[PDB]
């Protein structure tokens, strides 16, 4: 929703660079910590 | 064991992808009107040629692919026991 | 050691992993913020209620007395 | 190196996708409710439950 739905142009192209790869990957797993976070202190605000 | 690797991680991660887009199992075994007691539930389903498991989970993951699609087609033509019918899912199967 | 291709698509799954989670856990999260806000609204709401009749009761109670 | 920082980085991940889904508390993750209240405040709600839309 929030997001372009731009990404399916990327995921479908067979992966050949590593630095690309391995950044995307860490991007993918940074979004998930900080939603993780996220979620967790607007849990903690609610219960407060 | 390259190959090997490949297929235990396929395994694993189907599991992790099944868990990970909603799966229950036993409520899943009574739709399926099926027991669980003498069933492996968890990583090692398909252990054996698991029939009723992929079943379960091609009507799960047809229904969460398009609902409306599942009641038009699987609302007049549900064949999920049978050998006849079992053939007839493998062809709509096949189709899509 | 798996070659480099079988790695590839072994990061492509974990991203696959990673987007799916963040997906899901953004639909639970809207869904929660809108019961959230729904309920914590509405008891905001009586909250406002109750103070207005217990001011009611205050500015009666200190009427009667000074009378 | 690139070759062993990706292979710990491979390596790191598997565990971590191996230890979130080895919990069977994931159903609060997946549901996150809303339930702190007592049980003498529902009524309150359900008093006007179908004027707030």
């Known amino acids: 929703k929030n997001s372009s739905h731009h990404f399916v142009e990327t995921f479908n192209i067979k992966p050949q660079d590593l630095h690309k790869c391995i950044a995307r990957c860490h991007f993918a797993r940074s979004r998930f910590l900080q939603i993780l976070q996220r979620q967790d202190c607007v849990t903690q605000k609610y219960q407060e | ?96 | 050691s798996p070659d480099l291709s079988e790695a590839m698509e072994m990061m492509e799954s974990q991203t696959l992993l990673l987007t799916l989670l963040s997906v899901k856990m953004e639909n639970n999260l809207a869904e929660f913020e809108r019961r959230a806000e729904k309920n914590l609204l509405i008891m905001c709401k009586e909250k406002e209620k109750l103070q207005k009749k217990a001011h009611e009761l205050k500015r009666r109670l200190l009427l009667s007395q000074r009378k | ?53």
């Open chain 2, 1 to 96: 064991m390259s190959s090997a690797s490949v297929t235990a991680f396929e395994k694993e991660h189907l599991w992790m992808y099944l868990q990970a887009l909603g799966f229950e199992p036993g409520p899943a075994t009574i739709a399926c009107g099926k027991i669980v007691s003498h069933t492996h539930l968890g990583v090692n389903m398909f252990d054996k040629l698991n029939r009723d498991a992929f079943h379960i989970i091609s009507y799960f993951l047809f229904q969460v692919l398009d609902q409306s699609l599942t009641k038009e087609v699987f609302k007049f033509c549900w064949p999920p026991f049978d050998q006849k019918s079992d053939t007839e899912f493998r062809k709509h199967c096949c189709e899509w």
């Open chain 4, 1 to 53: 190196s690139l070759m062993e920082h990706f292979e710990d980085t491979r390596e790191k991940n598997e565990a971590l996708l191996g230890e979130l889904f080895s919990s069977p508390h994931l159903q609060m993750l997946l549901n996150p409710e809303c339930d702190p209240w007592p049980l003498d405040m529902q009524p309150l709600l359900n008093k006007q439950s179908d004027d707030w839309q």
